[PDB]
Symmetry: C3
Subunit: 262 residues, 3 copies
């Protein structure tokens, strides 16, 4: 756990422009691993915040007309500042509104990681694709979709699912950690977007190892939290997830990581 | 527990336009009973979302000028789509601002359930929850749920009084704003819902609250909230049937 | 615990205009001590809400162009209604945008408590450009701020500082786990509001009791045998606030004058 040690020591300022359902959970997840979250949404303070920040998360869960301009503006401010952007195109497949916005954003700014479930990333690369908010199952290959998305955007792609897929540069990786209770907790993937941002340390082209570690730290903590004897369900799980992220050590991480290339 | 089994299996898409204090808790309550919550607030996507959704919740807890037009617009889009609306007129009696807005909304769109406490519903129409709920039903021709010590439901020609739940619910900020969401989860795209679905929504919620508050690890309103979510997640037919408490009136008028 | 008993009995309507990360936790914190929170943000209902309310919290954690005017308007409405205001200038030192806004607000309205950490309050007074002839500890900063604003100052930190009228106090309760929970200080702003009972110039004893209740509850929660970290801490903090009694309070309070 190279990068996590550095997060706990350096306390990286991690800006989050995220959706209204998950702000509190995202901030508590970041605080638990030692990062310094800031949910700054005013374009007027983006320049000064971004100079000293290590990453920015943009998550469009609750996109409205009031957000659209601000989001484009702060993405551009981030590019000018060399601040890496993690982008979560939540439920992009569910509306033509979200598809058009995501297209505009990816034409207006370079992002450093694109993270979503299989249907979300599919809808990005194929605008006839369709979803609810959740992901169509049996999607074709998360691996094939991630590789196609990488070729199009030349940006690291993370596809979450039963198993998680990461594509960066010439490598593709499949990870197989976590718990089913994660899917019954509303912040989870939106929180993962924030955690990934916490691992970037101002690298606009992040090392795949940093992404692998972000996802594995999150999923291993979930795994362990769900095994706790006081985990009685999705309610009690969530405080335990945060405890487990706080205490996670090298030994547990190395014992539990499940990873495979190509 | 006819309806709850179906929610767990079908995973109904349940749109929530609700207040900024309760969004997270409402989404988690829904997820715990197997629904699929989506807090979509842009009128620009309402048409597409609503076509495939099973209900919409409108809760005005944190109503501001920025919400007013959007809410009226999406309620109209829900009506055009045949998507049932649950309406929570939060604190409508506390300001003329809310009274005027609720009036405009109910003049602009047909809703499928109106839910509040007694003084909220009273303030809508202008202690005795049953009478108030009947009066409100006559005016709006829409199912009324009034929450209180005992809960009242009026739909079509029936009125019912329910007596489940816990005092700790009143010391948790999401509770009733969550109940609005849960009820939306039980609608399955019926614009005129069966009273049995509303009875089940309310009883599931209150029975889970009862059982959560009896848990040995419940030490107060803090620990009660996670346990409430656990208990909604696990709630079974046996516990439901053992604990439900009802009282009742048939054949009312027009 | 004079004031806390009265909160549990009287159930004071406490209006919170606070940031989007902490609304729910602030409402639950207020509910747990017996207060009645209302997160009303429309200027259009402020006059009616404020007539019957006991305090207003204003916390600028997620300040945007859409908040600025509304916040100035409601502060003015609060002044006209005699409703006391607790003001949390979150991260004011981090941008010119926040510095200018906090200035505008404090030129536009009289607040009843100003709460922040040392570097927030220091940035407030450094930007007033009044401190001719001015390392600095919290006590000195709080006194400098009091002289400028003539308004109770609470500075949170390792030890907490309160300055009201001619007294300064240093408190030493709490837990490090508080710093690892995102609502905490923003919640303390709301708890302090809950203790004001419509006093625009609150007695320092009320402010002492607000802060000590909060920090003593945090202390006890963190000792609980089911507290395994910042996650489980938060629900136990709410439980502890709900059950906190006179005996625990008197046993644990740690307080020193100037």
């Amino acid at each position: 756990m190279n990068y996590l040690n550095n997060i706990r020591i350096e306390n990286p300022l991690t800006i989050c422009y995220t959706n209204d359902v998950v702000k509190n959970f995202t901030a508590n997840g970041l605080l638990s691993i030692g990062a310094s979250p800031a949910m700054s949404e005013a374009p007027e303070e983006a320049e000064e915040f971004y100079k000293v920040a290590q990453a920015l998360l943009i998550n469009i869960g609750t996109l409205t007309a009031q957000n659209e301009q601000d989001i484009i503006a702060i993405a551009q401010t981030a590019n000018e500042a060399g601040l890496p952007i993690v982008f979560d195109p939540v439920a992009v497949g569910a509306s033509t509104y979200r598809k058009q916005f995501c297209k505009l954003l990816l034409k207006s700014a370079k992002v450093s990681v694109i993270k979503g479930n299989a249907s979300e990333i599919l809808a990005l690369i194929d605008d006839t694709a369709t979803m609810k908010g959740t992901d169509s199952d049996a999607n074709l290959d998360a691996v094939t979709i991630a590789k196609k998305a990488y070729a199009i955007y030349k940006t690291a792609i993370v596809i979450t699912g039963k198993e998680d897929v990461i594509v960066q540069g010439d490598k593709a990786i499949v990870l197989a950690n976590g718990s089913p209770l994660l899917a019954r907790v509303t912040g989870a993937g939106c929180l993962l977007g924030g955690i990934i941002a916490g691992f970037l340390f101002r690298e606009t082209e992040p090392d795949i190892e940093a992404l692998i570690e972000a996802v594995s730290v999150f999923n291993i903590a979930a795994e362990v939290a769900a095994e706790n004897e006081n985990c009685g369900g999705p309610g009690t799980f969530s405080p335990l997830l945060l405890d487990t992220l706080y205490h996670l050590n090298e030994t547990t991480y190395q014992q539990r990581i499940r990873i495979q290339e190509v």
